[PDB]
Task: structure prediction
Amino acid sequence: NDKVRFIKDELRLLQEPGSYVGEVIKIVSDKKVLVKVQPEGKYIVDVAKDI
Amino acid sequence: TGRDDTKETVYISSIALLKMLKHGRAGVPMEVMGLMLGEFVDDYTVNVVDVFAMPQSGTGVSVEAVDDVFQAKMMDMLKQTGRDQMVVGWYHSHPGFGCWLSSVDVNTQKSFEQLNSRAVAVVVDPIQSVKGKVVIDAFRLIDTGALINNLEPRQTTSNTGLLNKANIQALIHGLNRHYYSLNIDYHKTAKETKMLMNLHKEQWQSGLKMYDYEEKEESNLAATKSMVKIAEQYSKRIEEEKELTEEELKTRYVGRQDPKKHLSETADETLENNIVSVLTAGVNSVAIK
Amino acid sequence: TFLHLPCTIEAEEAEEIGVEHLLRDVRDQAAGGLSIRLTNQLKSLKGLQSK
Amino acid sequence: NNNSALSNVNSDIYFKLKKLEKEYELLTLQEDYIKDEQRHLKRELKRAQE
Result:
């Protein structure tokens, strides 16, 4: 049972959309941060609920 | 208000499904323009017997992509065979985007909404359908004035109350201001069930056939040899494994692509084959002679 | 006269996707594990006799 | 010390323990059920890999 749920779990997250990676250039006081994505422009984007 | 405005459970038959996928996968890149023909009952149940691809166009999706000659032509000939049904909405392909209605798709939607206010717009993306429900979803206009005054949820009774959406983006932006989303279900009979599973009288035929023994003997040797080689890996593993930390065991002596595990599966596989090979052989020897 | 030919199903790509999806049964025959083929062997024998 | 009570045992066999012997057949029924469950999840392994 655990083995079937995990394979479905691997599959699940592949169906979910991709992910990226940038580096924070500066901090905004609107509860946001300014990120620069490595092949892409700057974005000011909301932050995760855990930080 | 004057309607219940509760989002319909969409039961698209298995006959209809097959049609809908076929027409959108064909037309890629391109948006394919069709209509849904069924019968609306209740205040929450639509049953879609069949769908029609109206002829493909180079204007994309618009109200200036409805063709009433072509619409009528379909209708008139259903009557004549007695298979008559009425529109309950319309469908279309996105050739490489997620499921949402644009503003321009909302106005196509609007033409049918005059006809009946339980008009569904179904978006198919067939480059991402490797499963039959995935990346297909049905949407329905809500009244604009229900939005202003915040009566927008009221689809949460007469339904399962579960609602699986897909994506951030355009979806949540149109959900808010235009439409209410609800899952497409798929419905089928037991006559259809037998039709798919069954594979003629050549299905039983495969199960008494024997094969060239060059390939059988070859199959055996390959598996046999394979288990010597990863079984030296297994020797290393169970020579050690006297040291604490489970993770540390998996780096050092292996436990990531674990040798005991890989051997056991391959050993079982060829063992099951050869139980079959002798059974199917001994069956034929007695049976046919 | 009418002469019989092979009446095969092989399916289209398009068709395959709706067919598996609707399916939630373990199939008449699929020929997967050993369990399916042990059933199958005995089914074949009844098959040969009927023709 | 010496002696006990032999009626204390004889009483429990017909009363309480007869009910519990029957209860042990309902856990035996559980065994047959999870014999199929264990095979069913082997079939479901095949389908998740495919």
Summary: The longest helix of chain A spans residues 2-15.
